[PDB]
Amino acid sequence: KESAAAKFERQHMDSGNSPSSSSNYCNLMMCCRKMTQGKCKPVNTFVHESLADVKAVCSQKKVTCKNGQTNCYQSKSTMRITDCRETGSSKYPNCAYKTTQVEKHIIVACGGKPSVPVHFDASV
Amino acid sequence: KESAAAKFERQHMDSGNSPSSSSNYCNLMMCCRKMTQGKCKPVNTFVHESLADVKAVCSQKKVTCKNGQTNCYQSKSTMRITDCRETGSSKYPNCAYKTTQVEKHIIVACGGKPSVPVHFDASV
Ligand SMILES: O=c1ccn([C@@H]2O[C@H](CO)[C@@H](O)[C@H]2OP(=O)(O)O)c(=O)[nH]1
Ligand SMILES: O=c1ccn([C@@H]2O[C@H](CO)[C@@H](O)[C@H]2OP(=O)(O)O)c(=O)[nH]1
């Protein structure tokens, strides 16, 4: 069981950061969304457009998937996204990310019926 | 098994106008630090001071805990803290917090050997 001391540190300590930062977004979000367990997911993109807009990409332009599958689609317009890229100094379990605010077209793999995004392939 | 659609939403969707804004700190932190599982923790304080300074509180001013326990201590000096409190709109699983940065004395319960903070009781 997690020690009471460790629980206090988890719930109540943030010595190394503050709210006023913008650069800590990826560190917190990758943690929040469970992509830092077992290993640090090296690269991950968050999209800030509506879910409806992102879902709509599956009905937009067919493009090549980076993995050679044929289920990828590119957004008709640029989208507000944040790229989270693991830094050189990052070392599990202390997963460190550079937060980059970007506006680019996204490419998603789609699957299911209705076809919805299942994989974030790239931004272009 | 988590659906592919849900996994994409978890990993890639953060719909909104200002994801990295300071106002979002508590939303990110309460999530990352595992205080939004099952229910939204209603109130939680983060401390931005050195862990050494927070541990030092266990040797400072004795004060009675809110719950009547007798192992609480108040910091001699004010500390930089962030209050996270559920908004009137917050409803699990969509927890929502107001982030408030203040400087106040902290009150913590101290336990174990070495005697260290185990519970955050109050700010004053
Ligand atoms: O710009 C990018 C490029 C890659 N990725 C994630 O990393 C996986 C392998 O490239 C991509 O497939 C994707 O992870 P997945 O959706 O499969 O969980 C991004 O998130 N953004
Ligand atoms: O992390 C925490 C947890 C609790 N509290 C104070 O204790 C009350 C009961 O949870 C919380 O309501 C709150 O007292 P209040 O500030 O509302 O007077 C904290 O201050 N920080």
Report the amino acid identity of residue A5.
A
CA B64 to chain centre: 21
How was this entry determined?
Answer: X-ray
∠ CA B51-B53-B57 to the nearest 5 degrees? 110
Judge whether A71 is annotated as a binding position. no
With vertex at residue B63, the alpha carbon angle to CA B58 and CA B64, rounded to the nearest 5 degrees, is 115
Q: Name the burial class of residue B22, with classes exposed (0-12), middle (13-18) and buried (19+) by CB atoms within 10 angstroms of its CB.
A: middle
Q: Angle of helix A25-32 relative to helix B25-32, nearest 10 degrees? A: 40
For residues A115 and A55, what is the distance between their CA atoms, to the nearest angstrom? Answer: 8
CB atoms within 10 A of CB A115: 15
Closest C-alpha to ligand 2, atom 13: B122
Q: Is A75 exposed, middle or buried (0-12, 13-18, 19+ CB in 10 A)?
A: buried
Residues 16-55 of B with CB under 8 A from A: 16-17, 19-22, 25-26, 28-29, 31-35, 44-51, 54
Interface test with A, best of B3, B9, B10, B20 (most A CBs within 10 A): B20
Q: How many helices (DSSP H) and strands (DSSP E) are in chain B? A: 3, 7
In sequence order, what DSSP letters do the residues of B37-79 get, joined into one string? SSS--SEEEEE-S-HHHHHHGGGSEEE--TTS-S-EEE-SS-E
| Nearest Cα residue to A118 out of A69, A61, A49, A76 | A69
> Measured from the CB, is residue B44 less than 6 Å from ligand 2?
yes
Residues in CB range of A5: below 8 A, 6 or more apart = B112, B116, B117, B118
Q: How many whole angstroms separate alpha carbon B45 and alpha carbon B60?
A: 20
A23: CB partners within 8 A, 6+ apart: A98, A99
Q: Please give the structure tokens belonging to residue B86.
A: 């559920």
When computed from its CA atoms, the radius of gyration of chain A, rounded to whole angstroms, is: 17
**Contact indicator for B73, B106 with CB cutoff of 8 Å:** no
Specify the DSSP class assigned to residue B90: -
Sheet holding A106-111, edge to edge: A61-63, A72-74, A106-111, A116-123
| Binary contact (A120, B11; C-beta < 8 A) | yes
Q: Are B120 and B70 in contact (CB under 8 A)?
A: no
What whole-number distance in Å separates Cα of residue A109 and Cα of residue A102? Answer: 20
Asked if B12 and A45 count as a contact pair (C-beta separation under 8 A), the reply is yes
Backbone angles phi, psi at B29, to 5 degrees: -70, -45
Bin B16: left if φ > 0, else alpha if -120 < ψ < 50, else beta: left
- The residues of B annotated as belonging to the active site are 12, 119
Task: Give dist(CA B97, CA B22) in Å, integer.
Answer: 12
Contacts of A10 in chain B (CB under 8 A): 33-34
Domain that holds residue B117: 1-124
Nearest CA to ligand 1 atom 18: A119
Q: How many domains does chain A have?
A: 1
Instruction: Yes or no: say if B13 and A45 are a contact pair by the CB < 8 Å rule.
Output: no
DSSP H or E stretch at residue B97:
strand B97-104
The domain that holds A108 is classified in CATH as: 3.10.130.10
